[PDB]
Design a protein around this ligand. Structure first.
Ligand code: GTP
Ligand code: ACP
Ligand code: A9Q
Ligand code: GDP
Ligand code: MG
Ligand code: MG
Ligand code: MG
Lengths: 421, 316, 54, 437
């Protein structure tokens, strides 16, 4: 359990993926040229989890960049850390996917998928002991959603005994590009239910609400949302990247997922982005507050199955334990009783950039059903009139596939309701 | 806030206690099987003491002392008084008792009965001739109230906290008969509220301490404190100090308190005899509020504090 | 209070104090259970691959 | 002289093993390079310490030990540690991928692939013995390797070394120092599979060690190093009889004869005193009566439970330091008058006592202070059944919803093994109730 192979697909997937590599490269002291210029040795102890070491003492991210149009990857290559990626790991087409799940999954994506698999195989073959894969994408478009899920299925066929982890961005009419996003998202959620072990649900509605209401941004852009996403991604990979007392993707899945289908996690972060450091009780209170959640679901409308929480910075372990036990004991009604000791706490001495202390939250909560309900409703309102279906039947799909996707989604919702009671 | 759970719906005392705790605003009730609690109002039987004191960051308290059943079961009370050198059977305040099975003490009970019968003696058995469980001597010469020529028993409530301080509630209850005692129908021989139900002399066949004390003054020229209470406090202190090493939670990973109901009998020479010890007793309607609030103050808030006393501390 | 069996050497001593008198599965079978588990893993993986082929 | 071979499995077993062998070297005067200047028989001998150390022609004293783990991080510490020169590379066995806290992965998927290699290295150790006694097996209950691989290894050792004794040192899980939510499952599964193959097992609850470190050593947040040094003192007092001259517990079968009257009830409770902080420049030296009395305080036990509410089947007192029998007997008389020590009526009410004159040894610069006398009591009491009950209850909470079960069935296990293991544990609790009344 050492190496992780990272994959980023489509516009959203490549933009948040680029930000992720920029942030964690800064944390491990890796410059844009791939040279280490850090001060501590803790940044290099587990750097091979995400980086290959090339001769000349260079570190190259183990990352694969995928898209059906070249624009976003062109902007990545010219980005701040664009030079650090392996040039052969850029795999792209020209047609695009038109915000259409069928084009990404069945027609345009099928041509490029074998090239992607060749690069994945080349990266996996150099791994001393591969753990699995992490994929960044959105569910509302065409390439990340359709071709991304196609890729997950093919990878599972070739590597059935490795972990599959995703960061999946959920659409919202408040931050919307096209009216067909509920169709694409509903088709993708069934794929994720079958073929991932862990999925972090990043809701664009919650990201917008945080930028508008909390960060006091009258007009949030995609960059403002991606600031929150990259902070969260660094937080949740901290314990994979640094000497931890525990982590790896399989022990994460084993400890967080009591039932195979219910593996959709609600993440959170504190403090939300000044010179004053937050105290431990403030970190703990904010980290459990709904306003710090990245999925637009009220945790007081459901129950926690399992929780993992990471504290970063130099602080008192005793105070952290006292505060975590405090919030559990004072909010014990929102934790299931039939899983004893279901809250795990970790501490890392290295804080992220520009913060003296921070806290990251990973919750497996039944309140996530609200997210799926929202999408289900938006699907049905259109599907009962078959509105916009010709974009999909024109690519060879039948109405029956939509009926089955909808039924599968409502089944997932009812399963969450089953364990909530 | 503080955390408590409820696991006995038949306890009037602790139903009132939980109601008061909810009337505090700093306590909140959990589901009965939630392990993250500060205070447990546990069940009467098979209380899982082994599961207490293993929750990180929780000071846990329970309203029962594990091992106190030895004092509150009749056969085990007899055995405890006989085999404990601190009591040594030779104590003057417990009647001659023997435990019989349907080691066995049949031969010894009949043996002493042989010396007693020739002269008389009347005995009693529960759990004048021997041929017709625990069998002890029936106090044939009880103190009878007048007017009425009627017997009674004395109920005292005692609270033992987590530090093994012993508190005697200042208010006790005499449970009296109504029919005159006939030493030749067991209603006049048996003192029980349910058995009596009646209510002619006092309400509910129960008399309180101010009235009984005034009666002792007017009739027998003495006080309740002098003639009776010294003996009751001595008996309570002896019984609880005896088992303190076996049940104390002084160095234990959880803490205990418990409310006991001592039952006494008084003979016509003003000698107090311990009848029995109850581990889950009831109370009197006029005393529920006072005694329960005292339970909160002395037993609960002493461990979990908030933002003259009604008890007498029996030093030891 | 009877002390019995006192043994003394240059490194120490030992004794007993009395206060009151009183009142396998074979190798083939293991291999069988292991191989049976492996067969169940194999059957589940074949069902997965059949699903993916559909 | 008869040899004992130590086997350390998983992270907990390996780290505890390092602490133990460090303490052994300090106790016997063996330097980190393996040289022993007090050993005048070079390249051989049948002295007491030779039960745990072999000798090379160059005068190196090599532990009779094997370290096994499915991931290489922890054993790599041994390979570059202070006592790296002590061990040969064949004694250190590592895999590539750990059991992910999954008993089924450690017992079935991965154990089948490495068990023959492990047994072959063990056989290499056995070939050097002129009269092997058996094995001492260190492991956790909660880890995938410590539970799953140990159960498999114990079955094979019963097959291949039928007449050898096998003792365990087992780490019972505590949420204060916990690593996985499925540790109850792994604990029950491994106890069920191991019960018939273990002659005597010393459980150590991490909750108790944690509380003793916080209370007696004034350590706010104890690390694995603190816990393991305290644990290693306990193990050392338990095995000192095998390593030094003496008459009590001089072979592994004596542990069973002395401590275990029925095969299934083979889990003695260990209590140790005194644990005093090194930071205090002065502390008062506790007498024989005081440390013996301390053996009956729950706060000093290796597993938290209340012995007042159980019955004893055997009791062994192991002293080290300035201790003479007269004081031990006086102290025992006082304890009998002041405490409730009830035996079952089909056992004698005696105490077996052993005394080593060499006072305990502590690691220089460690947290434990040097004391003039110490004692470890090993008693087989039904009160330890409380720990089983606690564990079983947590099991029942998850298994009623089948939470996490798919992870085990996914590795080749059947649901029937869960219920079978739980029924065996229910029978064990029944046995303890019958003996304890
Ligand atoms: N006392 C003590 N307990 C430990 C130590 N290391 C791990 N543990 C405990 O062991 C349990 C975790 O199991 P491990 O032994 O680390 O796991 P493993 O045997 O390596 O199995 P996998 O890692 O799952 O392959 C938890 O209950 C930990 O608290 C240690 O050094 N000392
Ligand atoms: N040895 C004795 N001498 C005289 N009267 C006795 C006696 N033993 C019992 N009694 C009478 O019988 C009554 C009940 O006996 P007992 O001790 O069994 O109370 P009890 O257990 O039935 C209900 P409680 O919980 O209120 O004690 C006593 O109140 C007393 O009046
Ligand atoms: C803050 O910590 C983490 C942060 C990020 C993490 O993934 C990248 C992990 C990985 N995990 C999760 C986990 C959760 C548990 O509970 C839900 C648990 O069980 S527990 N409480 O220790 O008994 C054990 C674990 N072990 C792990 O490695 C931990
Ligand atoms: N948070 C975030 N969301 C994005 C970004 N870009 C696109 N989206 C969302 O992703 C969906 C559009 O899909 P997109 O990734 O652009 O299409 P694709 O190229 O076919 O995969 C819509 O829900 C958009 O709101 C981004 O940079 N950040
Ligand atoms: Mg787009
Ligand atoms: Mg009664
Ligand atoms: Mg391990």
């Amino acid at each position: 359990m050492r190496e992780i192979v990272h994959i980023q697909a489509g516009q959203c997937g490549n933009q948040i993926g680029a930000k992720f590599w920029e942030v964690i490269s800064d944390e491990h002291g890796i410059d844009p040229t791939g040279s280490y210029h850090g001060d501590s040795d803790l940044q290099l102890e587990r750097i091979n989890v995400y980086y290959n070491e090339a001769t000349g003492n260079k570190y190259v991210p183990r990352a694969i960049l995928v898209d059906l149009e070249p624009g976003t990857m062109d902007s990545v290559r010219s980005g701040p850390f664009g030079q650090i990626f392996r040039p052969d790991n850029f795999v792209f087409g020209q047609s695009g996917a038109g915000n259409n799940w069928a084009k990404g999954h069945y027609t345009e994506g099928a041509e490029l998928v074998d090239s992607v698999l060749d690069v994945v195989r080349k990266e996996s073959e150099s791994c001393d002991c591969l753990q699995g894969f992490q994929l960044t994408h959105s569910l509302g478009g065409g390439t990340g959603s359709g071709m991304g899920t196609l890729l997950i299925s093919k990878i599972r066929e070739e590597y059935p005994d490795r972990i599959m982890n995703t960061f999946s961005v959920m659409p919202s009419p408040k931050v919307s590009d096209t009216v067909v996003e509920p169709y694409n998202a509903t088709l993708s959620v069934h794929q994720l239910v079958e073929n991932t072990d862990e999925t972090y649900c990043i809701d664009n509605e919650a990201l917008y609400d945080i930028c508008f209401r909390t960060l006091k941004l009258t007009t949030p852009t995609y960059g403002d949302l991606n600031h929150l996403v990259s902070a969260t991604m660094s937080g949740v990979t901290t314990c994979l990247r640094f000497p931890g007392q525990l982590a790896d993707l399989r022990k994460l899945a084993v400890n967080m997922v009591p039932f195979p289908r219910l593996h959709f996690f609600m993440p959170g972060f504190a403090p939300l982005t000044q010179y004053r450091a937050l105290t431990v009780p403030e970190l703990t209170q904010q980290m459990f507050d709904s306003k710090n959640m990245m999925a637009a679901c009220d945790p007081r409308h459901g129950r926690y199955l399992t929780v993992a929480a990471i504290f970063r910075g130099r602080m008192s372990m005793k105070e952290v334990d006292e505060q975590m036990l405090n919030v559990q004991n004072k909010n014990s009604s929102y934790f299931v009783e039939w899983i004893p000791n279901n809250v795990k706490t970790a501490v890392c001495d290295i804080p992220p950039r520009g913060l003296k202390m921070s806290a990251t939250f990973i919750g497996n909560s039944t309140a996530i059903q609200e997210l799926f309900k929202r999408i289900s409703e938006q699907f049905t309102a259109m599907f009962r009139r078959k509105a916009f279906l010709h974009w999909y039947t024109g690519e060879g799909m039948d109405e029956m596939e939509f009926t089955e996707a909808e039924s599968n989604m409502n089944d997932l919702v009812s399963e969450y309701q089953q364990y909530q009671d | 806030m503080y955390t408590f759970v409820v696991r006995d719906e038949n306890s009037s005392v602790y139903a009132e206690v939980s109601r008061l705790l909810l009337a505090t605003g700093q306590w909140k009730r959990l589901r009965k099987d939630n392990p993250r609690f500060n205070l447990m109002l546990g069940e009467r039987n098979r209380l899982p003491f082994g599961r207490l004191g293993h929750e990180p960051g929780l000071v846990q308290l329970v309203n029962y002392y594990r091992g106190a059943d030895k004092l509150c079961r009749k056969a085990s009370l007899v055995k405890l008084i006989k085999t404990s050198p601190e009591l040594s059977e030779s104590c003057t305040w417990f009647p001659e008792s023997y435990v019989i099975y349907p080691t066995d003490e049949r031969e010894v009970f009949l043996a002493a009965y042989n010396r007693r019968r020739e002269g008389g003696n009347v005995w009693i058995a529960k759990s004048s001739e021997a041929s017709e469980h625990v069998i002890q001597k029936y106090l044939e010469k009880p103190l009878l109230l007048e007017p009425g020529h009627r017997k009674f028993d004395i109920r005292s409530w005692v609270l033992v906290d987590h530090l093994y301080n012993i508190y005697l509630y200042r208010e006790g209850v005499l449970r009296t008969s109504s029919e005159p005692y006939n030493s030749a129908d067991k209603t006049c021989h048996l003192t029980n509220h349910c058995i009596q139900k009646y209510g002619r002399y006092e309400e509910g066949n129960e008399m309180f301490f101010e009235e009984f004390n005034q009666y002792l003054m007017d009739a027998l020229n003495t006080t309740l404190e002098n003639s009776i209470l010294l003996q009751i406090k001595h008996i309570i202190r002896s019984c609880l100090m005896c088992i303190e090493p076996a049940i104390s939670t002084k160095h234990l990973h959880y803490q205990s308190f418990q409310l006991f109901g001592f039952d006494f009998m008084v003979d016509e020479e003003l000698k107090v005899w311990l009848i029995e010890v109850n581990g889950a007793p009831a109370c009197a309607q006029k005393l529920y509020a006072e005694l329960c609030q005292g339970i909160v103050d002395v037993a609960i808030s002493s461990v979990f504090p908030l933002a003259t006393s009604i008890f007498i501390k029996l030093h030891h | 209070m009877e002390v019995i069996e006192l043994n003394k050497c240059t490194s120490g001593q030992s004794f007993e104090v009395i206060l009151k008198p009183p009142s396998d599965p074979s190798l083939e079978e293991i291999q069988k259970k292991l191989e049976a588990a492996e067969e169940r893993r194999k059957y589940q993986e074949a069902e997965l691959l059949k699903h993916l082929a559909e | 002289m008869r040899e004992c071979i130590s086997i350390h499995v998983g992270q907990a077993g390996v780290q505890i093993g390092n602490a133990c062998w460090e303490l052994y070297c300090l106790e016997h005067g063996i330097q980190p390079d393996g040289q022993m200047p007090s050993d005048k028989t070079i390249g051989g001998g049948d002295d007491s310490f030779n039960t745990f150390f072999s000798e090379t022609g160059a005068g190196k004293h090599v532990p009779r030990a094997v370290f096994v783990d499915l991931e290489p991080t922890v054993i790599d510490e041994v390979r570059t540690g202070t006592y790296r020169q002590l061990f040969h590379p064949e004694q250190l066995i590592t895999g590539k991928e750990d059991a992910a806290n999954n008993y089924a992965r450690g017992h079935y998927t991965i154990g089948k692939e490495i068990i023959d290699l492990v047994l072959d290295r063990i056989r290499k150790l056995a070939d050097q013995c002129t009269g092997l006694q058996g094995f001492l097996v260190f492991h956790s209950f909660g880890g995938g390797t410590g539970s799953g691989f140990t159960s498999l290894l114990m079955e094979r050792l019963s097959v291949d070394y039928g007449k050898k004794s096998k003792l365990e040192f087992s780490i019972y899980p505590a949420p204060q120092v916990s690593t996985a939510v499925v540790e109850p499952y792994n604990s029950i599964l491994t106890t069920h599979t191991t019960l018939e193959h273990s002659d005597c097992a010393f459980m150590v609850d991490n909750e108790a060690i944690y509380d003793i470190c916080r209370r007696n050593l004034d350590i706010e947040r104890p690390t694995y190093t603190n816990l393991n040094r305290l644990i290693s003192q306990i193990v050392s007092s338990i095995t000192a009889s095998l390593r030094f001259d003496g008459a009590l517990n001089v072979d592994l079968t004596e542990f069973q004869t002395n401590l275990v009257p029925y095969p299934r009830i083979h889990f003695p409770l260990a209590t140790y005193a005194p644990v005093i902080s090194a930071e205090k420049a002065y502390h008062e030296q506790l007498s024989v009566a005081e440390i013996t009395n301390a053996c009956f305080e729950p706060a000093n036990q290796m597993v938290k439970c209340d012995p007042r509410h159980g019955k004893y089947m055997a009791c062994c007192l192991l002293y080290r330091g300035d201790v003479v029998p007269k004081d031990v007997n006086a102290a025992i008389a006082t304890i009998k008058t002041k405490r409730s020590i009830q035996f079952v009526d089909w056992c004698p009410t005696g105490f077996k006592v052993g005394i080593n004159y060499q006072p305990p040894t502590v690691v220089p610069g460690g947290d434990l202070a040097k004391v003039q006398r110490a004692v470890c009591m090993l008693s087989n009491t039904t009160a330890i059944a409380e720990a089983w009950a606690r564990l079983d209850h947590k099991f029942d909470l998850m298994y009623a919803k089948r939470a996490f079960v798919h992870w085990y069935v996914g590795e080749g296990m059947e649901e029937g093994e869960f219920s079978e293991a739980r029924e065996d544990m229910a029978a064990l609790e029944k046995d303890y109730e019958e003996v304890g009344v």
